[PDB]
RNA sequence: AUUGAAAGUUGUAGUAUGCGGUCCUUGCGGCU
């Protein structure tokens, strides 16, 4: 597995799906980067390097597989079963009622990010709570710009716009290369355009598997699956897929989640927006009670568009 | 082949208008 590290020179824009044309709708608000955007940046580099075989021009997916992405300062969205109570974010474990897994009422969820070490303790079921100071928020930087007339140096009519950028220190991407020679091509490049407004990020590439993908969790009936990237597909099909890949049937499951992630994007091949897809948002947790004990995998890919970085679930246990 | 491409928060704008360092005060006492 190859590990790509993107270091933004300054700011990044991963624009939400909304009109953003000069002289009209003029507000661009960034979201947390979707893995397909990172995949697109890599595919575009290969598209220009002449490796159009691995790109998948006009195709939904490339030949290579983007395992997933993570932002860094490496941090992850607070699991949705972690609820803020006073100055602490408390882990809420599944309960049972009428023979069904439920999450007991303990307050509303508040968004935020935690370090990889805090997530690791969570996945091992050893995390009780997190002090509110260790819960990170992503910094935004709002910039307001204009367009000037060529000669008179005054603002052209209606040419004012606003961008809410993200201030991100690092983005990590992991790629499985079936022999396209991506590691060599990425090594030849120092930087690439990532997201909107022609912002660039420095590129480093190392041949390594992150330790979080190599954890030994043991065997249990009570496994959980933390989605680190958006996961596309019906919950039923995802659970069924999970049953097949682990060769074990499920007694019951509970999806703790939030607002669905709206995913469209821009088709650079056809020069028009991509079709809207809906996904289980990062930070969502699928609690599963298998009928038999399973060896909980450190990570597992689920749902549609796996090669674009979607459906990266991190294994964990609960009691 | 990335909700992507493209867009100078710029142009005009005097820290200025009014305002007394003035009022009260014996170079004197006779001492060292
Ligand atoms: Mg632009």
């Amino acid at each position: 597995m190859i590990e790509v590290t993107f270091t933004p020179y300054d700011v990044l824009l991963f624009r939400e799906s909304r009109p953003f044309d000069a002289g009209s709708e003029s507000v661009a608000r960034s979201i947390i980067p979707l893995p397909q955007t990172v995949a697109g940046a890599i595919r575009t580099l290969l598209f220009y390097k002449g490796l159009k075989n691995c790109v998948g021009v006009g195709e939904e997916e490339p030949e290579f597989t983007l395992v997933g992405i993570a932002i860094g300062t490496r941090i992850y969205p607070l699991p949705f079963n972690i609820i803020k109570s006073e100055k602490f974010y408390k882990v809420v474990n599944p309960g049972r009622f009428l023979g069904k897994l439920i999450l007991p009422p303990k307050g509303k969820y508040k968004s935020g990010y935690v370090t990889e070490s805090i997530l690791e303790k969570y996945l091992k079921g050893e995390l009780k709570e997190v002090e509110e100071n260790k819960v990170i928020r992503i910094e935004k930087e709002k910039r307001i710009g204009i367009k000037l007339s060529r000669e008179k140096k005054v603002v052209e009519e209606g040419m004012l716009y606003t961008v809410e950028f993200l201030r991100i220190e690092k983005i990590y991407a992991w790629i499985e290369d079936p022999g396209c020679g991506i590691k060599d091509i990425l090594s030849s490049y120092e930087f690439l355009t990532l997201g909107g407004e022609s912002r660039v990020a420095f590129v480093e590439v190392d041949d390594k598997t992150p330790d979080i993908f190599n954890r030994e969790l043991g065997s249990t009936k009570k496994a959980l699956f933390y989605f680190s990237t958006p996961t596309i597909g019906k919950v039923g099909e995802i659970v069924q897929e999970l049953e097949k890949r682990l060769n074990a049937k499920i007694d019951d499951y509970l999806l703790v989640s939030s607002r669905p992630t709206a995913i469209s994007g821009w088709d650079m091949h056809e020069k028009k927006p991509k079709g809207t897809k809906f996904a289980i948002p990062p930070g969502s947790v699928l609690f599963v009670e298998f009928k038999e004990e399973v060896e909980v995998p450190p990570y597992i890919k689920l749902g549609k568009l796996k090669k674009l970085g979607y459906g990266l679930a991190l294994g964990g246990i609960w009691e």
Side-chain angles (χ1 to χ4, degrees), chain A residues 130 132-133 135-136 138-143:
Chain A
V130 187
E132 64 175 350
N133 267 10
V135 170
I136 317 177
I138 304 303
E139 296 178 340
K140 285 180 166 292
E141 186 174 310
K142 175 179 180 172
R143 300 185 179 186

Side-chain angles (χ1 to χ4, degrees), chain A residues 13-24 26-48 50 53 55-62 64-85 87-95 97-105 107 109-123 125-127 129-130 132-133 135-136 138-150 152-155 157-168 170-188 190-207 209-245:
Chain A
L13 174 64
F14 303 97
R15 199 180 93 233
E16 61 181 356
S17 182
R18 251 190 179 91
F20 182 56
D21 306 288
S24 309
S26 49
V27 183
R29 307 182 310 172
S30 184
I31 61 175
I32 298 302
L34 300 174
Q36 75 186 37
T37 311
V38 174
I42 299 163
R43 293 164 84 185
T44 290
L45 213 173
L46 302 181
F47 179 87
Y48 287 151
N53 174 86
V55 169
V57 183
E59 310 288 282
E60 278 188 331
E61 294 178 292
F64 65 90
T65 294
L66 181 59
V67 175
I69 62 171
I71 61 184
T73 64
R74 194 149 56 230
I75 60 178
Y76 299 91
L78 265 172
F80 284 115
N81 68 311
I82 301 180
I83 288 83
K84 182 173 179 297
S85 182
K87 302 181 187 300
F88 289 92
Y89 290 75
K90 301 185 185 302
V91 180
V92 177
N93 286 313
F97 185 69
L98 301 180
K100 289 185 173 182
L101 290 180
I102 61 173
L103 218 63
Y109 171 89
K110 182 182 181 63
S111 185
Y113 278 74
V114 288
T115 60
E116 189 164 81
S117 57
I118 297 294
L119 182 62
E120 284 172 341
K121 284 183 291 186
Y122 168 89
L123 298 173
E126 299 178 10
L127 185 73
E129 67 186 13
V130 187
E132 64 175 350
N133 267 10
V135 170
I136 317 177
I138 304 303
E139 296 178 340
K140 285 180 166 292
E141 186 174 310
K142 175 179 180 172
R143 300 185 179 186
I144 300 186
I146 55 185
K147 178 154 75 125
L148 298 174
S149 301
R150 174 183 295 174
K152 301 186 294 295
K153 204 195 177 180
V154 289
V155 179
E157 183 173 304
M159 290 307 184
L160 181 126
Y161 72 106
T162 297
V163 184
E164 296 181 11
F165 291 102
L166 296 180
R167 273 281 180 186
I168 299 185
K170 298 284 177 180
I171 298 176
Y172 292 88
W174 302 280
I175 303 177
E176 288 179 339
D177 189 14
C180 312
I182 294 183
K183 175 177 165 55
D184 289 323
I185 297 183
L186 289 186
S187 289
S188 63
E190 268 56 59
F191 56 84
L192 54 77
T193 38
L194 180 59
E197 302 302 77
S198 293
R199 303 297 84 201
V200 291
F202 297 112
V203 179
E204 303 173 88
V205 43
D206 203 320
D207 213 279
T209 296
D211 184 72
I212 191 168
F213 291 175
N214 287 320
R215 295 166 302 127
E216 286 190 302
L217 298 168
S219 191
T220 180
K221 294 171 60 179
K222 296 180 174 182
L224 65 87
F225 298 85
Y226 169 89
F227 300 113
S228 65
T229 60
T231 302
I232 306 173
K234 300 180 185 296
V235 174
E237 305 192 48
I238 296 171
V239 171
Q240 281 185 325
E241 175 183 2
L242 179 62
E243 285 180 321
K244 297 183 178 183
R245 297 194 180 277

